[PDB]
Symmetry: D2
């Protein structure tokens, strides 16, 4: 081989019956958060990390639905591919399903229902996606660490343990649903055994990187918003939250077309074409306004 | 007897991109799909035979969600509206479904809440001739059909989206009609529901009941208003430990389905709050 | 005749630091002070003579806000509760104010909304003997006085904050009493409102009306619930272009103040939406 | 004189009748935003800028009320003083009223009803308060620039004009209610004439710095939240917004006691005393928890 890059996975899996009957009609990661489908937020997050090649993993039923919404990604300067998860057998299963898509590249996994907002978010992802060996994750102070993977730090701020959904959390630092990996992850994933719960656990993957001294745990500070989209009540909170930012600023959070245009993955002419069929609503108007406004 | 029509029509691109993935009247308002609210309204009016009209794209969706209704003691049929050519078009599309019966039309994105709502609908469905509509005081009557009243409280004019509204009373998206409505609908020229209602008013056959300020009438037309409606329902539901517009519950309380059938519908939802709630309805007395 | 008591008692430190700067029942729920809601409730029950009971710190505040009531056609008096020693203490403090009349007690942080609320209070104020209270279905009956009903819907027990509630029916913070309540209150031992109500129940003189699910009963006890109540009122108000619990409007519609007096009250508020609204009430018919 | 600092002003003025009747009972900047009084947010902002000597300007009626809430500031390691504004004759009046308090020091003015949130907010204020000459302001993209002082930028991103409440804004960049000044501001303030509106305008002050080439205009990016507290509807939005962050994180935004403790203006023993009278509620519990939890 002669030499002369990082791929993305969004896991937009089966949310069971927990949100029924809202989710009988459609899958969770197609429900909107305010003005746009849920999937637009993690997708925008990957794009902001600089990732253009992305694998959307969803149920067999829902795959066609995501495909229709997003296509191959070519209109936004992306290359989207699709795969199915027959059964919700754990988040780490994404690496077995995604094996051939990853190939010998670096990867990044994002949960389909994870929403992030804040200043210099681009720069915080930059430093994770720039480290070419090991794994990088983010830890975020929360009220209810029991629901997540919890990181324990020593007095020097070094990460020393990881626990999935501990009943007695060692700290309030939760592992967020955004993960960066080197080429070792597929092989670490293949050697995992199901948990007592029947799942291939992402925390087991991260524990394996930690055990080799190859796990970077960056803090995502309190000045960032990491929102919960797990309940009816939290989905509603996230909507309110985005609407308040958007109506205050006259700017959008996680508008993929805008992110593609600012990254130079699409040009002015292409952005204008995408604005055309949306011209009679606020979203298309906003795309048009981006052609002529300078936004710092 | 009285049949129902839910018009769950084409919202265009106005709510894109939320609506690229799915039609509007399938978006949830808090914990359930939008369509559940007007459907519940019809059920509360005592109507079991109901026509769901939607776009060609969305009609199969609503079918796939709701089926023939038989699990909730209903009889649901489906029809398509090729182009959003006005709300009155429901009566042409719905012609053969209505047959020679009385009808009721409800808008697919109209949400109602309040005390004795069952009784308020009762009096409208009970009037066997003419048409019945409801007027509700709003901030922005320009968006709606506006009713003008004389000093005696008699309705004397109707205007669709007037630039200078004569009053702040808006016509809500719930309409009751006799057997004349199909023929009135056929004779309309370019297709407004306000024209239909104006024809009933011109013959002295339009009842305009006030829906008082103690009732909530919410519009799910915008991203902002959809979010308002969610907050509103969630606050009521979490306060009461009771649901608003749960079709299964309405069917059970109307005796259109029995305890055994309710239990079967609770089964596949058992692992979430909605199924638990259906189960709890078998054993709790709720006044 | 029936007198009113608003208990606007000491919230302790539980809402600090919001409440360091001012008492709770002066915090606004959306556009108006909290106290306006229970006050409006009493006015809607037809009660004009009202005792406001609060802490020593906060009583002068409520006085300075509301005065003697004469601008709204009311007669407001004030009294203090030195220590938050239970809601039933209102009747000892309020003894000489009540005199030999019938009474009504409302909690200072209780918010009610819905259709025909005037009529529901009417039937309670109209019963001249015994006591009347309202039961409302809630998610968390542990926080309240809980009513247990038999299979015939008769009330058979009352429990204050039981760990194992017998039903989900909570007693709301609105109470109507005959002339027996002062003497029942004096004979209580360490001072619960549920004990007072239990004494009426034990003599077969407690009416427990259901406040149905079509009514909203909101609690303003927490930061979270205060915020919920704000959202809820704002959504109704911005939808309707009408206010909930505007005392001036209630006084005007009850004929306790006239058009001229309403106009004077609109004057100093003219440059904001609230004064504009009072002005608009002089000329708009609202059903 | 022998040599061997920056003072703050919070303008918490008369909001007229615009929010009546909510504001009949009490002044605006004492209304809570969620769990805490409004004044706590701009105060926390000054503290985060490193400012300990602060002048609270309010109406004659409301002064005693702020005083009771906040005292002399000594419990939080601050030195708070108070002054009255007899009539709401414009924001720039703060420098005439504050003349003797400012003396020959550098200053910072913050509006009493301005709420800010985001990542590295400390660092963004640091670079403004660190510049010892000229003035520094912040520009923030909004939907409704008409309501504010608007900044116009040239193609190189240089600020070239300032307009107060223009009916036809030149950009969507609004000047936020946070201002840093050198020793020239009192004298610039003294030479101002009332506007057509009867007000001593802050924008006139800022225009004078601009005209001498001494106005730094830093962008406050979209990843920051700058919230509106001007209406009943916006006050409610700000509450929802703070509550969603706080309940998600189990951390507080603009808790002055926490900011004083992290700045080392008060010690562990002092923080424990302040937690005592609040022990039976969530706020005091949170102060206590800060003594033992490491928070990054
Ligand atoms: C507010 N954020 C954001 C931005 N910061 N930006 C500016 C941007 C765009 C492309 C590349 C950049 F480096 C910065 C956007 O164009 N859209 C955004 O939503 S964000 O970084 O917090 C964010 C990005 C993606 C998904 C969620 C939040
Ligand atoms: C809160 N409401 C309500 C009720 N009052 N009821 C009880 C009910 C059911 C059938 C007949 C009745 F009279 C009362 C419900 O079972 N579900 C409800 O959502 S409502 O009448 O205002 C309503 C009905 C239909 C759709 C939305 C709200
Ligand atoms: C929406 N409601 C309401 C009204 N229905 N009315 C109209 C009114 C006034 C006096 C007597 C009436 F029957 C009706 C009001 O004038 N103000 C109101 O807030 S309410 O009856 O549910 C209510 C009354 C008192 C306090 C809060 C809500
Ligand atoms: C979330 N923010 C914040 C923080 N970032 N911090 C951490 C902190 C405290 C003191 C000094 C620091 F450099 C950082 C806090 O202790 N409390 C806070 O509210 S903030 O910077 O966006 C903020 C600070 C003051 C007022 C409003 C927001
Ligand atoms: Cl931060
Ligand atoms: Cl009503
Ligand atoms: Cl009811
Ligand atoms: Cl930013």
């Amino acid at each position: 081989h002669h030499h002369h890059k990082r791929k993305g996975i969004i896991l937009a899996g089966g949310s069971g019956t927990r949100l029924h009957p809202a989710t009988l009609a459609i899958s969770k990661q197609l429900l909107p958060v305010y003005d746009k489908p849920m999937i637009y937020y993690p997708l925008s997050t990957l794009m902001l990390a600089g990732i253009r090649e992305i694998l959307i993993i969803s149920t067999p039923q829902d795959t066609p639905r995501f495909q229709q919404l997003l296509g191959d990604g070519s209109n936004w300067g992306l290359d989207l591919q699709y795969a199915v998860q027959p059964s919700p057998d754990g988040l780490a299963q994404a690496f077995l399903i995604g094996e051939s898509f990853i190939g010998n590249d670096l990867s990044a996994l994002v949960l389909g229902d994870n929403l992030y907002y804040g200043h210099d978010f681009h720069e915080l992802l930059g430093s994770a996606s720039q480290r070419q060996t090991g794994a990088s994750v983010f830890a975020y102070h929360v009220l209810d660490p029991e629901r997540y993977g919890v990181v324990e730090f020593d007095q020097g701020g070094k990460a020393i343990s990881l626990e999935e959904k501990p009943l007695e959390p060692k700290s309030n630092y939760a592992v967020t649903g955004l993960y960066f990996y080197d080429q070792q992850v597929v092989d670490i994933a293949r050697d995992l055994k199901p948990s007592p719960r029947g799942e291939l656990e992402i925390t087991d993957v991260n524990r394996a990187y930690l055990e080799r001294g190859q796990l970077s745990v960056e803090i995502m500070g309190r000045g960032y918003a990491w929102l919960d989209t797990g309940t009816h009540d939290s989905l509603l909170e996230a909507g309110q939250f985005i609407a308040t930012l958007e109506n205050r600023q006259g700017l959008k959070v996680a508008c993929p077309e805008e992110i593609a245009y600012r990254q130079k993955w699409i040009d002015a002419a292409q952005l204008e074409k995408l604005a055309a069929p949306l011209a009679k609503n606020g979203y298309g108007q906003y795309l048009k306004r981006l052609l002529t406004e300078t936004v710092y």
